[PDB]
Structures are given as structure tokens and as C-alpha cells.
Amino acid sequence: SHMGQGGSNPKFENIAEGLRALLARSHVERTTDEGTWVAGVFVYGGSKTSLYNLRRGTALAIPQCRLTPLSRLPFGMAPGPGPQPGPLRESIVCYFMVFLQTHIFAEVLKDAIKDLVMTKPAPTCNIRVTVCSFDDGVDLP
Amino acid sequence: SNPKFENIAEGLRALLARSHVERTTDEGTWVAGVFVYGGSKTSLYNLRRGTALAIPQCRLTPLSRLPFGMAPGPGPQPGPLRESIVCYFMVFLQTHIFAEVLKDAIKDLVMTKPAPTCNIRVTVCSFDDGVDLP
Numbered sequence: 416s417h418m419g420q421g422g423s424n425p426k427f428e429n430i431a432e433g434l435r436a437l438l439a440r441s442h443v444e445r446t447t448d449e450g451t452w453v454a455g456v457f458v459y460g461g462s463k464t465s466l467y468n469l470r471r472g473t474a475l476a477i478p479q480c481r482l483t484p485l486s487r488l489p490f491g492m493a494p495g496p497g498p499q500p501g502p503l504r505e506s507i508v509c510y511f512m513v514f515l516q517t518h519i520f521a522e523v524l525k526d527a528i529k530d531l532v533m534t535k536p537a538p539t540c541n542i543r544v545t546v547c548s549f550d551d552g553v554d555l556p
Numbered sequence: 557s558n559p560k561f562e563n564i565a566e567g568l569r570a571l572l573a574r575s576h577v578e579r580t581t582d583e584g585t586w587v588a589g590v591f592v593y594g595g596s597k598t599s600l601y602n603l604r605r606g607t608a609l610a611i612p613q614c615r616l617t618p619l620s621r622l623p624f625g626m627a628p629g630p631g632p633q634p635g636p637l638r639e640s641i642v643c644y645f646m647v648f649l650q651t652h653i654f655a656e657v658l659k660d661a662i663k664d665l666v667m668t669k670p671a672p673t674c675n676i677r678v679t680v681c682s683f684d685d686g687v688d689l690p
């Protein structure tokens with residue numbers, strides 16, 4: 416497999432390769448004739464840098480998906496202090512979302528991310544992922 | 557101090573007052589939500605501020621940007637990271653039944669306003685395993 420100068424590849428390139436290997440095990444539909452964005456994977460935690468690398472690598476591995484930027488999560492129970500109402504207060508935990516056209520491919524991608532990050536050192540192995548569904552889809556522009 | 561955000565919150569509260577469904581659970585997990593997008597960046601921001609005031613039981617992301625969808629024609633598709641000018645935010649909720657109520661309330665609220673507010677779109681979403689908000 417390809418190796419960059421000095422015998423190393425960037426982390427996001429190695430994520431893309433690892434995702435490609437895992438996804439190759441599952442020959443599931445990634446697209447529909449309707450082309451609606453009805454499924455997704457919600458990815459969070461770890462660290463901003465680890466999510467940055469995972470986001471870039473997911474994009475490289477999967478042309479059939481669409482990704483949000485990195486952003487931040489609000490708190491759960493008992494938000495931290497701030498001048499704004501509690502629902503708005505931002506934690507330091509980051510997230511991004513992947514939009515997908517099929518529910519099964521969201522499940523396969525969720526499992527692939529979980530399997531991949533378990534092989535990486537902290538904080539990357541602390542990344543969390545859940546499938547999500549959009550009842551009416553998201554009409555991406 | 558912020559009459560604009562408080563007016564939006566009052567309009568939302570009036571719509572939400574017609575329902576009495578549970579907004580919280582003993583489990584306290586964030587298993588549903590509403591995904592709100594379009595309009596304009598500023599109108600979405602204003603709606604987000606009003607929602608925070610009307611619904612203490614929810615949690616909100618900041619605004620962010622949507623990627624593109626499919627391009628018509630045979631030409632190139634956008635790369636997965638390409639960002640559009642269309643923004644979104646997410647509302648996290650502890651019950652799906654209240655997510656459905658909030659989605660209906662937002663739809664009813666924004667359709668009373670001029671563009672671009674009335675162009676805001678909303679869908680219920682669900683998280684299979686929940687989101688462990690910190």
C-alpha cells in the first residue's frame with residue numbers, strides 16, 4: 416500500500432484506508448433512486464484533533480456521504496456556567512454529522528468507525544458514534 | 557432585555573401550550589431531536605435563542621453549515637466536506653413524542669413570518685443509541 420515520504424502517512428489518510436478495508440466487507444446499498452438524505456452517523460467526543468482526522472478520512476473514503484463541519488455539543492444534565500440560558504451553553508466536546516441515503520449504510524459506517532477507533536490510542540479511541548434518522552430527510556442544497 | 561428573542565419564545569410557548577406531552581424521562585437520555593435548517597443564518601440564530609427560552613428541557617448546538625446534496629446532471633458531485641451557505645442547528649430532546657410536538661410548533665411559528673424566516677425547515681430526528689451529552 417502507498418507510503419508517503421519518510422515511511423509515514425498522515426493520520427487522516429490512514430483512517431481512510433482503514434475505513435475502506437472495513438467497509439469492503441459489507442456490500443450494502445449506499446444510494447437510492449430518490450436520493451434523499453434520510454440517515455446519518457453522529458460522531459462526537461475524543462478530542463477536536465482526533466475528530467478532525469476522522470472527518471477528513473471519512474470524506475476521503477466515502478464519496479457517497481456528506482459531512483458537516485466540526486462543531487460543539489451543549490451540556491447534558493447540569494450545564495456549566497454562562498450568561499446565556501442553559502440550553503445554549505457550549506461544552507468543549509466536539510461533534511460532526513455524516514448524512515447518508517440509506518439506513519443500512521449508516522449502520523455499517525457506525526460499526527466501521529467503532530471498530531477503527533478501538534485500534535487507535537487515546538483520545539481517538541474515546542470517540543463515540545450513533546446512527547441517526549431524519550423522519551422527513553434533510554434537503555441538502 | 558432581548559425583546560426579539562423573548563417574543564419568539566412567547567410565540568413558541570403559545571403553540572407548545574396546546575400539548576401536554578412529557579418532555580423529560582427518568583432515564584434522562586438524549587434520544588430524539590429536531591433538526592432545524594435553512595432560512596438565513598440570522599433568522600435561524602434568532603429562532604435558536606427563542607427556543608432556548610421556551611424550552612429549558614432541551615439542549616442546542618451552535619449554528620453550523622450544511623454540506624451540499626446531489627448535483628443534477630452528469631458533472632462532478634461535490635466532495636463530502638464542501639460547505640454550503642445554508643445553516644442548521646440541532647435540538648436535543650429526551651422524548652420523541654415531544655420532538656414531534658416541537659417540530660409541528662416550529663412549522664406553525666415560522667409560517668406566520670415573512671421570508672426568510674418562513675423558509676426555515678425542520679425535521680424530527682432520532683439517535684439509535686442516544687447522544688451522551690457531557
Ligand SMILES: O=C(O)c1cncc(C#Cc2ccccc2)c1
Nearest residue numbers: 563564567598599602603665673
Ligand atoms: O425574526 C426572526 O429572525 C425569527 C426567527 N424565527 C422565528 C421567528 C418568530 C416568530 C413568532 C411567531 C408568532 C408569534 C410570535 C413570534 C422570528
